[PDB]
From Swiss-Prot:
Effect of residue 375 to N: In Nagasaki-2
Protein name: Albumin
Gene: ALB
Disulfide feature: 53-62, 75-91, 90-101, 124-169, 168-177, 200-246, 245-253, 265-279, 278-289, 316-361, 360-369, 392-438, 437-448, 461-477, 476-487, 514-559, 558-567
Modification type Phosphothreonine: residues: 83, 420, 422
Outcome of substituting residue 269 to G: In Nagasaki-1
Upper lineage: Eukaryota, Metazoa, Chordata, Craniata, Vertebrata
Length: 585
């Protein structure tokens, strides 16, 4: 932005620590197989080189582009071909195709084992020793396992990791403090990874007019006082930002985000008052602050839509000759008044409005034909309101764990053809959504649950379609964006299903069970619960509790037994007995 040097410019804004944090990510996400130490020297080189340009913006390569700089360094990797090989012919190519070629050679599934969580004591100790290397090690390990993960986001997760350690590493029961939180942040990070991929998948299969419509609604809720032209300006920026972030171009994604963080804070008066504190913080501190900001208050000087979008005579004209803008306004208007709504409900209403006009416009008397359309919103709006109210009541009268159990039983009776894992996972995650969002007051529940919800349905939509088993689920999964959830809400109990033969599955076991945590054990109860319901699709709570206890007892006993694999074998057969009867079969 009129800065001879772009790197030293980025270095001033970011800062030394953030700058090293971000390079480490970038390189880790291609150099997944290179050693950590080789990375540290790399960041040290890049960081030294950038300070040379900080001092003299007219030094060397300090005029060159970041893409060139980056790609040059990555070609310097001399062990590349041995470890990577194909990513080396990316270097023969010149820019811009060179960076395009690297981009293509990122591995979505690095061939790397999962992380072995150490013990609280040793981790907190290694954290204390050298905090800075600890969080670099973490960044390295995560980045290299999540290559298309957005680097700023990851870095903010990093700082949150730092903060939870700083807290629990100076605490008494440490374990009974950290592990609860490590489980929270792990879940938030998969939430974020999966949300990214969803938006990028949505952009691709739903164009961009769609993503733009998403943006119109989201911003207008956050910035109800923004004048529509500002909103539109941001929609366009954000559109590009997201377009690049999805492409997998860190540099562009990261630097365009900083630009947009600049503009927004600069025009705080027109956009929102709530940017007060944000716009003060450092570069990638405000940045997340803006995105984390709370909704400004709407005006009270606010009429109904009706006059402009239902009553007005030159409406059909307006649609036809300028469709995008007219509906654009609808969206902004509808949204700015309704921050309690989820985005895709707002899209659903807009699409309902669209679908009317397309019809009523090229018709006899358009007015009386479309003049009833806001009454068609009422149920589209209430259906989800009821769902969340009623699920949250249930989540509240039960706890997380017993709420998962409810949904397990419910959803297995709906779609018993689905794999047991998919049901367990889906019901668990839905419960977590109750943990995260039910605590909030109604006006913030839909927005809060939406991100999570849409990612979870996706996860089942993905899994299922890898090996389809249910035509009712297929339909919902290949229904449109806006019809996806209602389809899922309309699933009814499956009658035709023929229960399973009362045999093994989750009835053959070993003493590998006696040695498991609450978490691993409740996933096994949950697994065992779903199976039961498959064996008896009309079993009951009082029937299931009874079998579940006989299960629980079979564990307590065989686990507290002198021999195990003999006990589990003898009593193994005799539990299918005391279950088959109990269920009423
Ligand atoms: C309490 C767990 C999450 C909610 C479970 C209800 C499943 C139906 C989804 C309808 C909710 C619409 C609003 C939203 O989630 O954004
Ligand atoms: C297990 C397949 C059926 C539903 C799976 C996802 C549930 C959440 C979104 C749809 C809401 C369903 C309403 C309900 O729970 O009764
Ligand atoms: C195959 C058995 C399913 C039950 C879940 C795994 C074992 C945990 C049972 C819950 C009670 C704890 C055991 C005990 O009381 O000793
Ligand atoms: C994340 C923006 C900071 C600069 C990263 C690329 C530097 C380089 O490889 O020359
Ligand atoms: C894209 C489906 C939603 C209705 C049209 C509004 C789109 C826009 O504001 O760009
Ligand atoms: C954040 C708690 C978990 C709910 C979000 C969905 C997780 C996933 O599908 O990976």
């Amino acid at each position: 932005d009129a800065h001879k040097s772009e790197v030293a410019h980025r270095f001033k804004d970011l800062g030394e620590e953030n700058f090293k944090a971000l390079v480490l990510i970038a390189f880790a996400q291609y150099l997944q197989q290179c050693p950590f130490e080789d990375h540290v020297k790399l960041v040290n080189e890049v960081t030294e080189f950038a300070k040379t340009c900080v001092a003299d913006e007219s030094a060397e390569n300090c005029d060159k582009s970041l893409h060139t700089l980056f790609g040059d360094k990555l070609c310097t990797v001399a062990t590349l071909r041995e470890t990577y090989g194909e990513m080396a012919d990316c270097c023969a190519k010149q820019e811009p195709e060179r960076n395009e070629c690297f981009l293509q050679h990122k591995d979505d599934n690095p061939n790397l084992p999962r992380l072995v969580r150490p013990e609280v004591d040793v981790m907190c100790t290694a954290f204390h020793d050298n905090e800075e290397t600890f969080l670099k090690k973490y960044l390295y390990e995560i980045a290299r396992r999540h290559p298309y993960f957005y680097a700023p986001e990851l870095l903010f997760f990093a700082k949150r990791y730092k903060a939870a350690f700083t807290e629990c590493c100076q605490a008494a029961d440490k374990a009974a403090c950290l592990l609860p939180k490590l489980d929270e942040l792990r879940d938030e990070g998969k939430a974020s990874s999966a949300k990214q991929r969803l938006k990028c998948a949505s952009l691709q299969k739903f164009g961009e007019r769609a993503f733009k419509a998403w943006a119109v609604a989201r911003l207008s809720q956050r910035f109800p006082k923004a004048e529509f032209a500002e909103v539109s300006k941001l929609v366009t920026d954000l559109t590009k930002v997201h377009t690049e972030c999805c492409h997998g171009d860190l540099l562009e994604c990261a630097d365009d985000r900083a630009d947009l963080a600049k503009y927004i804070c600069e025009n705080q008066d027109s956009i929102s008052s709530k940017l007060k504190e944000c716009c003060e913080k450092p570069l990638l501190e405000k940045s997340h602050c803006i995105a984390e900001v709370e909704n400004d208050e709407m005006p009270a000087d606010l009429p109904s839509l009706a006059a402009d979008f239902v009553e007005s005579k030159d409406v059909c004209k307006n649609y036809a000759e300028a469709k995008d803008v007219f509906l654009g306004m609808f969206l902004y208007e509808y949204a700015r008044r309704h921050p309690d709504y989820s985005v895709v409900l707002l899209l659903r209403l807009a699409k309902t409005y669209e679908t009317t006009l397309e019809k009523c416009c090229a018709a006899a008397d358009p007015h009386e034909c479309y003049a009833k359309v806001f009454d068609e919103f009422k149920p589209l709006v209430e259906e989800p309101q009821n769902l969340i109210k009623q699920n949250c009541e249930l989540f509240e009268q039960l706890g997380e764990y017993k709420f998962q159990n409810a949904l397990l039983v419910r959803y297995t009776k709906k779609v018993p053809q689905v794999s047991t894992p998919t049901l367990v996972e889906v019901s668990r995650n839905l419960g977590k959504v109750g943990s995260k969002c039910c605590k909030h007051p109604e006006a913030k529940r839909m927005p809060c649950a939406e991100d999570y919800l849409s990612v979870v349905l996706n996860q089942l939509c993905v899994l299922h379609e890898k090996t389809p088993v249910s035509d009712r689920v297929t339909k919902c999964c290949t229904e449109s964006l806006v019809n996806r959830r209602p389809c899922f809400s309309a699933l009814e109990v499956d009658e035709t299903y023929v229960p399973k033969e009362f045999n093994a599955e989750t009835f053959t076991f070993h003493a590998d069970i006696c040695t498991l945590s609450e978490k691993e054990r409740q996933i096994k109860k949950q697994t065992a619960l779903v199976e039961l319901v498959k064996h008896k699709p009309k079993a009951t709570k009082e029937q299931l509790k009874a079998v579940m206890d006989d299960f629980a007892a079979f564990v307590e006993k065989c686990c507290k037994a002198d021999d195990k694999e003999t006990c589990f074998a003898e009593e193994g057969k005799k539990l299918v007995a005391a279950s088959q009867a109990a269920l009423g079969l």
